[PDB]
Amino acid sequence: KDRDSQITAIEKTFEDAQKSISQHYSKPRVTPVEVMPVSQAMIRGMMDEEGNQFVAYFLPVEETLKKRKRDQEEEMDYAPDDVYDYKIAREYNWNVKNKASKFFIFREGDGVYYNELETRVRLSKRRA
Amino acid sequence: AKQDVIEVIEKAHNNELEPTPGNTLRQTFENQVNRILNDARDKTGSSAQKSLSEYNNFKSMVVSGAKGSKINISQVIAVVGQQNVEGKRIPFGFKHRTLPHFIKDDYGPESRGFVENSYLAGLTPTEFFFHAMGGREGLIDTAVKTAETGY
Amino acid sequence: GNDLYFVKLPNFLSVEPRPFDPQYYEDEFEEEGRTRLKLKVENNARIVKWSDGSMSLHLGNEVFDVYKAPLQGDHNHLFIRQGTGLQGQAVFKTKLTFRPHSTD
Amino acid sequence: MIIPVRCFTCGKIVGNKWEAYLGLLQAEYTEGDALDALGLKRYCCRRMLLAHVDLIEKLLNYAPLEK
Amino acid sequence: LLLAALGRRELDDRDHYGNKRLDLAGPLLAFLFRGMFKNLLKEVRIYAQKFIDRGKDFNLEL
Amino acid sequence: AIGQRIVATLPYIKQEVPIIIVFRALGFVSDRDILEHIIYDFEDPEMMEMVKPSLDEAF
Amino acid sequence: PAAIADATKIFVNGCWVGIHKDPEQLMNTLRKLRRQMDIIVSEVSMIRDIREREIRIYTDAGRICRPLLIVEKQKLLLKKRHIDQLKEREYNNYSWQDLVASGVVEYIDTLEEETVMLAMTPDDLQEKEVAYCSTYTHCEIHPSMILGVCASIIPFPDHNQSPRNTYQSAMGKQAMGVYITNFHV
Amino acid sequence: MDDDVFLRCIESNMLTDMTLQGIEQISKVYMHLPQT
Amino acid sequence: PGFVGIRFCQECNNMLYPKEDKENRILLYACRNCDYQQEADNSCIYVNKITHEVDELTQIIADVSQDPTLPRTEDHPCQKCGHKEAVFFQSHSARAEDAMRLYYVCTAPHCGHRWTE
Ligand SMILES: [Zn+2]
Numbered sequence: 001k002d003r004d005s006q007i008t009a010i011e012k013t014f015e016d017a018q019k020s021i022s023q024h025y026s027k028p029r030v031t032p033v034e035v036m037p038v039s040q041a042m043i044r045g046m047m048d049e050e051g052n053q054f055v056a057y058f059l060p061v062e063e064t065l066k067k068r069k070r071d072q073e074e075e076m077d078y079a080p081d082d083v084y085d086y087k088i089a090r091e092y093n094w095n096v097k098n099k100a101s102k103f104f105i106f107r108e109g110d111g112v113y114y115n116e117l118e119t120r121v122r123l124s125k126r127r128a
Numbered sequence: 129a130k131q132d133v134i135e136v137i138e139k140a141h142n143n144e145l146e147p148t149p150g151n152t153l154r155q156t157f158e159n160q161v162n163r164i165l166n167d168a169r170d171k172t173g174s175s176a177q178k179s180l181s182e183y184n185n186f187k188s189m190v191v192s193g194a195k196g197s198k199i200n201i202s203q204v205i206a207v208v209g210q211q212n213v214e215g216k217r218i219p220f221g222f223k224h225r226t227l228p229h230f231i232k233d234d235y236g237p238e239s240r241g242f243v244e245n246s247y248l249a250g251l252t253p254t255e256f257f258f259h260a261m262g263g264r265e266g267l268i269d270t271a272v273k274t275a276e277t278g279y
Numbered sequence: 280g281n282d283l284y285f286v287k288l289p290n291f292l293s294v295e296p297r298p299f300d301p302q303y304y305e306d307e308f309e310e311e312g313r314t315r316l317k318l319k320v321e322n323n324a325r326i327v328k329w330s331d332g333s334m335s336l337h338l339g340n341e342v343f344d345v346y347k348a349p350l351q352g353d354h355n356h357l358f359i360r361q362g363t364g365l366q367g368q369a370v371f372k373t374k375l376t377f378r379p380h381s382t383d
Numbered sequence: 384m385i386i387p388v389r390c391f392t393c394g395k396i397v398g399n400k401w402e403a404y405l406g407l408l409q410a411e412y413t414e415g416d417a418l419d420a421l422g423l424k425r426y427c428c429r430r431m432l433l434a435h436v437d438l439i440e441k442l443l444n445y446a447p448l449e450k
Numbered sequence: 451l452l453l454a455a456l457g458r459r460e461l462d463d464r465d466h467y468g469n470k471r472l473d474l475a476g477p478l479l480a481f482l483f484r485g486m487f488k489n490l491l492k493e494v495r496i497y498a499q500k501f502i503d504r505g506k507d508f509n510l511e512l
Numbered sequence: 513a514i515g516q517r518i519v520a521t522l523p524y525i526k527q528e529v530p531i532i533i534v535f536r537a538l539g540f541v542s543d544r545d546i547l548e549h550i551i552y553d554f555e556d557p558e559m560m561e562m563v564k565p566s567l568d569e570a571f
Numbered sequence: 572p573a574a575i576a577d578a579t580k581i582f583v584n585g586c587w588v589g590i591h592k593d594p595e596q597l598m599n600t601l602r603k604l605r606r607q608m609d610i611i612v613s614e615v616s617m618i619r620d621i622r623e624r625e626i627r628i629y630t631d632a633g634r635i636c637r638p639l640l641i642v643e644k645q646k647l648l649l650k651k652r653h654i655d656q657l658k659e660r661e662y663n664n665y666s667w668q669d670l671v672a673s674g675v676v677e678y679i680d681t682l683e684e685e686t687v688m689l690a691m692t693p694d695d696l697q698e699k700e701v702a703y704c705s706t707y708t709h710c711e712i713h714p715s716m717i718l719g720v721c722a723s724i725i726p727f728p729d730h731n732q733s734p735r736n737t738y739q740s741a742m743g744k745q746a747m748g749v750y751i752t753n754f755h756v
Numbered sequence: 757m758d759d760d761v762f763l764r765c766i767e768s769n770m771l772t773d774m775t776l777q778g779i780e781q782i783s784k785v786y787m788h789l790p791q792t
Numbered sequence: 793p794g795f796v797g798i799r800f801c802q803e804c805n806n807m808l809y810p811k812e813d814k815e816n817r818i819l820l821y822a823c824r825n826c827d828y829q830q831e832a833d834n835s836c837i838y839v840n841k842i843t844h845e846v847d848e849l850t851q852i853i854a855d856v857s858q859d860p861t862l863p864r865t866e867d868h869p870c871q872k873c874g875h876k877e878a879v880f881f882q883s884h885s886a887r888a889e890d891a892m893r894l895y896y897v898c899t900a901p902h903c904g905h906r907w908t909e
């Protein structure tokens with residue numbers, strides 16, 4: 001149709017989301033409490049095997065066997081199909097070879113700022 | 129009565145039941161179970177009948193012969209009893225089941241259509257369906273005998 | 280800071296993975312055309328939390344009430360994979376599990 | 384379709400109580416307390432108010448034959 | 451059939467509603483529509499044949 | 513005659529047809545093939561003797 | 572054909588399409604797929620006959636079925652959160668279809684009921700002094716749903732002789748009332 | 757016909773028509789004391 | 793005694809019919825389609841079990857232990873594996889009059905032992 005209206009309509013949401021809100025859409029009876037403002041790569045896990053890519057699932061604050069998840073590629077023919085594992089050492093830990101399991105968009109409280117970081121390709125790993 | 133039927137079932141399951149002359153083992157087991165449950169129905173009906181006072185209006189109408197029978201009183205007060213389809217207990221219309229609510233191969237009284245409640249107590253859903261089956265048999269008989277008898 | 284802020288928007292509400300910038304936006308799209316332009320104009324976001332517990336989407340004058348379904352079938356570890364380190368420097372933020380379905 | 388005038392059983396007037404009954408119900412009375420407030424003490428008149436379905440309100444959703 | 455004759459399977463129950471289907475408005479109107487569309491295509495065949503036998507075009511609307 | 517014969521009442525045909533004839537008409541002439549299609553467990557002679565009359569009737 | 576002995580046949584709408592080696596986890600996969608509203612739609616019936624190794628899948632029309640509550644080990648999948656979202660049905664547009672899509676409810680046809688072990692009420696799922704089943708798979712939403720439109724008007728129909736309930740179900744249809752609101756036109 | 761087929765035929769016949777004891781057309785008989 | 797199975801020709805794969813060789817006075821199995829012959833090894837041509845003394849344990853399959861609609865018991869442990877639970881069911885097969893007999897199957901996976909009390 002036209003761009004001089006699209007520029008202002010896209011900025012219009014960027015401006016209206018920051019106004020004062022005190023009412024619902026269907027029945028304006030519910031008062032708001034707070035607001036949650038908004039590449040990526042997520043390793044899916046199988047619910048039976050129950051996969052521990054992080055130390056959270058292991059119920060751990062930090063890595064008791066590492067200090068940096070150096071997510072490095074499995075090979076040269078697999079950029080999206082890397083090999084994520086929590087091993088700072090060349091130790092034969094759980095080698096979770098994140099196969100290519102090729103919208104699931106992710107965001108965060110980035111200091112109450114307007115951005116996005118939608119995911120690129122749902123990979124899923126197993127115990128190799 | 130239900131414990132008696134359970135005992136007969138356990139006997140049949142253990143091959144501790146031998147058939148009587150003129151019947152197969154299935155028919156003998158069915159005869160034993162039906163005898164137990166008919167005895168239960170009659171005993172409970174007698175209990176209800178003796179419980180009635182001289183002021184009871186069911187008893188008044190039955191005594192005068194105006195309407196009703198002692199079996200009706202038993203079904204209203206004591207127990208509705210066994211529901212039969214074609215003169216036998218409720219058939220296994222599912223695969224070795226009368227309803228999906230029972231286990232397979234369940235020849236117990238409640239599985240095969242014994243209404244252990246009265247009409248005042250109220251029927252359970254399976255008793256309700258089995259009683260509807262038994263009553264459907266009477267409706268079909270009433271609606272099908274007429275043409276042949278009139279002819 | 281580290282809280283789950285995952286949402287799953289349908290095809291007709293696909294927001295841009297990057298902030299709106301005049302050097303990344305262009306005019307290419309036009310009842311038939313009315314659903315077409317709404318992909319790159321209405322689609323930055325503020326997920327309001329109400330008092331009843333539910334959330335809603337605010338991308339303009341219209342409000343889409345969303346429901347933060349919490350799924351134990353897709354427990355993927357969501358991470359900001361930016362091309363910088365060895366192979367996509369996945370930063371550990373929040374594991375995606377709960378998916379919020381927006382709709383009119 | 385509309386609240387009867389009299390109670391079918393006794394002949395007590397209930398026609399003037401439907402609107403008051405509804406007003407008491409929106410005033411957060413229970414149906415029993417509302418019926419007590421209107422003076423319907425026999426269960427026949429309580430039957431009249433408690434079992435009434437105001438269908439006339441639905442018949443008034445249709446435009447009349449003449450404007 | 452052999453499993454039934456050997457007693458290894460039960461005979462099927464004619465009355466089991468798992469063995470039955472309810473022919474509703476849609477599948478019934480479909481039966482009608484198949485018959486009626488076939489008759490219509492037949493009538494179109496005769497009408498078009500009597501024209502092309504004369505070696506000239508015909509109007510499908512008629 | 514001797515045993516129980518299996519027949520097949522096909523549509524548009526006003527006479528019973530032995531099942532073995534139907535199987536051969538579909539391209540399965542060897543009796544082994546037909547019983548491979550009918551009897552899936554060759555360790556079961558009961559099924560075998562009950563199908564045998566149909567084979568004996570169609571040779 | 573030598574493989575058909577131990578294998579399980581698979582019929583789809585009556586057509587024998589193939590065979591399988593582990594029917595149990597096939598049925599688990601297919602039930603998971605139907606309960607997730609994946610490729611299998613809700614009205615598809617999937618019966619595993621175990622003693623005879625057929626797995627019959629039906630998608631055709633005319634199959635009368637009814638909804639039932641799926642049962643976990645010995646628990647309903649209908650948790651209190653579903654009832655909570657159903658209570659505010661008019662605000663959050665959480666409807667029946669969301670209940671079916673959650674894998675909490677399932678449509679079971681007459682032929683799949685043969686393979687189902689029903690609980691009449693969640694009280695049947697309680698552990699008892701002598702367990703009747705202890706391996707239920709579904710539960711009734713309410714047994715009174717076995718009745719139709721005219722029998723659902725009888726009060727206390729389980730305290731009547733069944734012919735009486737049939738005669739009322741016939742006589743509710745000759746009863747006067749307001750057959751429709753727009754009767755004036 | 758060959759001998760073995762003849763043995764099979766007479767087997768199938770003897771097992772049906774060979775009346776060892778009893779009267780034809782009488783399938784079953786029940787003996788009892790009449791209480792009435 | 794035991795039943796007798798059908799045996800097929802090695803050339804035409806048709807069933808071999810029984811025949812007697814007078815010259816050696818010996819049983820043969822010969823094809824009436826091709827000209828194949830074979831020396832029998834059973835000497836029995838036909839077997840009819842009128843009593844129908846069939847071991848229904850052979851008809852049972854362990855997969856039935858996966859049936860949620862069958863009853864389970866803890867009172868009859870498995871003699872092959874020691875599992876406590878076991879499903880039980882009746883014959884439900886035609887030509888079996890004394891069919892109140894119970895057949896048990898072990899619910900342990902990959903054991904599948906079947907028996908009868
Ligand atoms: Zn009154």
Ligand SMILES: [Zn+2]
Binds near residue numbers: 800801804826
């Ligand atoms: Zn040969």
Ligand SMILES: [Zn+2]
Binds near residue numbers: 903905
């Ligand atoms: Zn075992």
